[PDB]
């Protein structure tokens, strides 16, 4: 009799598990909304990351050795280096920062949440002063090397300042995931014990 | 088994009755204070 009572108490833990399945429905709805946002946002970043790998050594190496950089390349390269903690406006610092063979690695490492809001607003104002620039002269033929990296640079700013809309979303998601995963381990483990 | 389980749900109600016995202890303490006050006050009114 006592054993069956304990089994029912675990079936009561299972009822709590049905409540956790309602929590799972909430989690699925929130994750569906977040993944819809991610499908809207992240896929071009993935394409840019792939294109950065597609970038050939010759295209960048020939143009680094150029005596004078074209104005579009300067405009689109200064802001990219503003990401790389080497904030500067001189061509020789660009050349030195790009010379190292260790610069083929972090074309993908840079992450969207590391940017500061003031830098985001600065680059928004730079976009305003240079709206006809960027992807348009990428399409023209400014250079084959710039294209992937310029499109990478124009991104990561859309993610910024509306990932902060997703920050409370992902924090609530993390809370729900932790509670629900602990409760589902209880569900599997309580099911085993019952 | 279900009959026994209903009996033990009523035993959970008996645990609630033990909680109500704690409430009875509270009630007895408060009534003892009130009856002490009444013994102090009311008896001369009864005599009158």
Resolution at which this structure was determined, Å:
4.5
What size, in residues, is chain A? 194
Query: HEC string of chain A?
Result: CHHHHHHHHHHHHHHHHHHHHHHHHHHHHHHHHHHHHHHHHHHHHHHHHHHHHHCCHHHHHHHHCCCCCCHHHHHHHHHHHHHCCCCCCCHHHHHHHHHCHHHCCHHHHCCHHHCCHHHHHHHHHHHHHCCCCCHHHHHHCCCCCHHHHHHHHHCCCCCCCCHHHHHHHHHHHHHHHHHHHHHHHHHHHHHHHC
As a whole number of angstroms, the distance between CA B24 and CA B20 comes to 6
Interface list for A 6-25 with B (CB within 8 A): 8
Q: Please give the torsion angle defined by the CA atoms of residues A32, A35, A37 and A40, in that order, rounded to the nearest 10 degrees.
A: -130
Whether B5 has its CB under 8 Å from any CB of chain A: the answer is yes
Residues A7, A13, A14, A15: is their CA dihedral positive or negative?
A: positive
Contact between A46 and A101 under an 8 Å Cβ cutoff? The reply is no
Q: Shortest Cα distance from A3 to chain B (angstroms)?
A: 10
- DSSP, collapsed to helix, strand or coil, labels residue B1 as coil
Query: Which contacts (CB < 8 Å, 24+ apart) does range A80-89 have?
Result: A80/A149, A80/A152, A80/A153, A82/A119, A82/A122, A82/A123, A83/A110, A83/A115, A83/A153, A83/A156, A84/A110
What was the elucidation method?
cryo-EM
Rg (CA), chain A: 25
Residues A190, A6: Cα–Cα separation, whole Å: 11
How long is chain B?
A: 48
**Between A and B, how many residue pairs show a Cβ–Cβ distance under 8 A?**
9
- Contact indicator for A186, A17 with CB cutoff of 8 Å: yes
> How far away is chain A from the Cα of B13, in angstroms, using its nearest Cα?
16
A117: tokens are: 């809001």
Residues of A within 8 A of B8 (CB-CB) are 5
Q: What are all long-range contacts of A189-193, with beta carbons under 8 Å and residues at least 24 apart?
A: A190/A10, A190/A13, A190/A14, A190/A17, A191/A10, A191/A14, A193/A10
CA–CA gap between residue A22 and residue A28 (Å, rounded): 10
Chain A residue with minimal CA distance to B3?
A: A1
Nearest-angstrom CA–CA distance, B19 and B11: 12
Cβ-contact A145, A59 below 8 angstroms: yes
User: What's the alpha-carbon Rg for chain B, to the nearest Å?
Assistant: 20
Give the gap in angstroms from C-alpha A192 to the nearest C-alpha of chain B.
21
- CB of A5 less than 8 A from some CB of B: yes
- Determine, for residues A4 and B8 on separate chains, whether the beta-carbon distance falls below 8 Å: no
Name residues whose C-beta falls within 8 Å of residue A86's C-beta, 6 or more positions apart in sequence. A93, A97
Distance from CA of A161 to the nearest CA of B (A): 54
Coil, strand, or helix at residue B48? Answer: coil
């Amino acid at each position: 009799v006592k054993d069956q009572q304990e089994a029912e108490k675990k079936k009561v833990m299972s009822q709590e598990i049905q409540e956790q399945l309602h929590k799972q429905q909430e989690v699925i709805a929130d994750k569906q909304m977040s993944v819809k946002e991610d499908l809207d946002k992240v896929e071009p970043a993935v394409i840019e990351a792939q294109n950065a790998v597609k970038s050939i050594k010759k295209q960048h190496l020939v143009e680094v050795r150029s005596m004078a950089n074209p104005p579009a390349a300067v405009k689109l390269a200064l802001e990219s280096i503003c990401l790389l903690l080497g904030e500067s406006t001189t061509d020789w610092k660009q050349i030195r920062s790009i010379i190292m063979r260790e610069n083929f690695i972090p074309t993908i490492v840079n992450f969207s949440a590391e940017e500061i809001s003031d830098a985001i607003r600065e680059k928004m104002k730079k976009n305003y002063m240079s709206n006809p620039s960027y992807n348009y002269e990428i399409v023209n033929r400014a250079s084959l090397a710039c294209g992937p990296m310029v499109k990478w640079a124009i991104a990561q700013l859309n993610y910024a300042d509306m990932l902060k809309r997703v920050e409370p979303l992902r924090n609530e998601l993390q809370k729900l995931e932790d509670d629900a995963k602990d409760n589902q381990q209880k569900a599997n483990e309580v099911e085993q014990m019952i």
